[PDB]
Amino acid sequence: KVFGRCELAAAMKRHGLDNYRGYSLGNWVCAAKFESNFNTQATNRNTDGSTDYGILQINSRWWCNDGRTPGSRNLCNIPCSALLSSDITASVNCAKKIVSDGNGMNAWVAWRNRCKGTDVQAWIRGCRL
Ligand SMILES: [Cl-]
Ligand SMILES: [Cl-]
Ligand code: NA
Predict the structure, then answer these.
(1) Of 4, 14, 94, 124, which is least surrounded by CB within 10 A?
(2) 28: CA distance to ligand 2 center in Å?
(3) Any residues with CB less than 8 A from the CB of 55 and at least 6 apart, and which?
(4) How far is the centre of ligand 1, averaged over its atoms, from the C-alpha of 101 (Å)?
(5) A single Gene Ontology molecular function, please?
(6) Measuring CA to CA, how many Å separate 117 from each of 10, 30, 107?
(7) Total structural domains in the chain?
């Protein structure tokens, strides 16, 4: 499923991401835009053989099991395929654990390089929330 920008903002808000760990909703929408282009089915393979899954491109090296990242962990206790659902609950619940691990949203490279220090509120402007 490819979310609209306001559609995704409303779903993230319902799932508790607005101001979660001090990150306003615009940060989460901005990160999803540049990580996956709002596409829940996005996958990308990393150099170390791990793979990023879903609308927030969560890495199998640490966070989910795809059966093909040797020595990896599964800290969100989910199959990586669950991160590709049209239902974003699994992605949100896992992202909540990631952003709480000490490094905030710096875990997402696209957020650090393209969202951090910008007017992220522009990503939710005009949306009914
Ligand atoms: Cl915002
Ligand atoms: Cl980047
Ligand atoms: Na894993």
Answers:
(1) 4
(2) 15
(3) 3, 8, 32, 35, 36, 38, 39, 40, 42, 83, 88, 91
(4) 22
(5) lysozyme activity
(6) 23, 12, 15
(7) 1
Per the annotation, the verdict on 7 as an active-site residue is no
Q: Write the CATH number for 114.
A: 1.10.530.10
User: What tokens were used for 128?
Assistant: 């009914």
Catalytic pick among 7, 18, 48, 52: 52
CB-proximal residues (5 Å) to ion ligand 3 = 60, 65, 69, 72, 74
What is the sign, positive or negative, of the torsion defined by CA atoms of 16, 35, 87, 83?
Answer: negative
Q: What DSSP letter does each residue of 87-99 carry, written as one string?
A: STHHHHHHHHHHH
User: Could you tell me the CA-to-CA distances from 9 to 42, 84, 101, 116 in Å, in that order?
Assistant: 18, 18, 23, 18
| Cα 57 from Cα 53, distance rounded (Å) | 4
CA 124 to CA 62: how far, in whole Å? 30
Q: How far apart are CA 41 and CA 127, in angstroms?
A: 24
- 35, 66, 87, 119: the active-site residue: 35
- State yes or no: is 66 an active-site residue: no
